[PDB]
Amino acid sequence: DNILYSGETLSPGEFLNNGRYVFIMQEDCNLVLYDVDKPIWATNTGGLDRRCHLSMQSDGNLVVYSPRNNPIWASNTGGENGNYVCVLQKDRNVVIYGTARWATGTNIH
Template identity: 65%
Template sequence: MASKCAAISITHLIPILLILGTLNISFCNADYVLLPGENLYTGNSLQYNNYVLTMQQDCNLVLYDSGYPVWATNTGGLASNCYCAMQYDGNLVVYAQDGRAIWASNTGRENGYYVLVLQKDRNLVIYGTAIWATATNAANSAKMSLNKVMNTNETGSSITNLVTSV
C-alpha cells in the first residue's frame, strides 16, 4: 500500500483531529481514512479489517467485503489511470488521467476540512466541518437534563424550563 501523506497546517489539522477523535480513530493505524487533499491512486486501497475500498485499474472505485463487491462507482472502462480525490470542499471525485471528473459524490460545499472514513460497520462516510454546534458534548461537559415544571398563577398556566445538573 502506497503512502498517502499530505502537508497540512496545524490550523487545518485541529478540526480534523476533533472529528476523528469522536470516531475513536488512531492516526497510528489510519489506513481507512482519506484526508482532504489526499488521493487514492490506481491499485491503492483504504482498508478496515475485511472491508477494502480500492481504486481499480479500470477506473472503478469499489468497496469490498471479504472479497465480494458491495458498492461501486460503476466507472469501470470510462478511462484509465484514474485516481480518487478527497477534496477540501467535501466532494469525493474520481478523476481520469487527463483531469476529467468521471464520478463525484456531489457533496461539495464551502472549503473546509472533510475526511473520508471507511467505518467498522462497512459504511463509507464523508465527515466534514461543523456548521453549528451547541457545545454540549456530554463527554466534555456536565451532563444536563431539561425538566419542565408547570407553574400556575392567577392568569392561567405557564411552563418554565429549568436546567439542572444530573
C-alpha cells in the same frame, strides 16, 4: 489506513482498509467496496478509461478523475472550504464527515 483526508488522493491500485473490508481505486477506473471477495458497492465506471485517481477535496466533494483530469464520478457534496474526512468504517459504511468543529491543535508536520 481507514481514512482519506481532505487534500489527499488514492492513486491507481491504492486503497483504504478496515478488517475484512477494502475500498479500492482500481486500475480499470472503477471505485469499489469489497467484503473479502464480494463487491458490495461501486461507482460503475469500470472500462471507461485507464489509471484514474480518487480525490477527497477541501471543498468537501469526493471525486474520481480521469487520466486527462476530467471528473467521471462525484459525491456532489462540494461546498464551504474546510477540513473533511472520508472514512471506511468498522460497520462497513463509507462516510464523508465535515467540516472540523473542534480540535486540540496538537498537529505536527
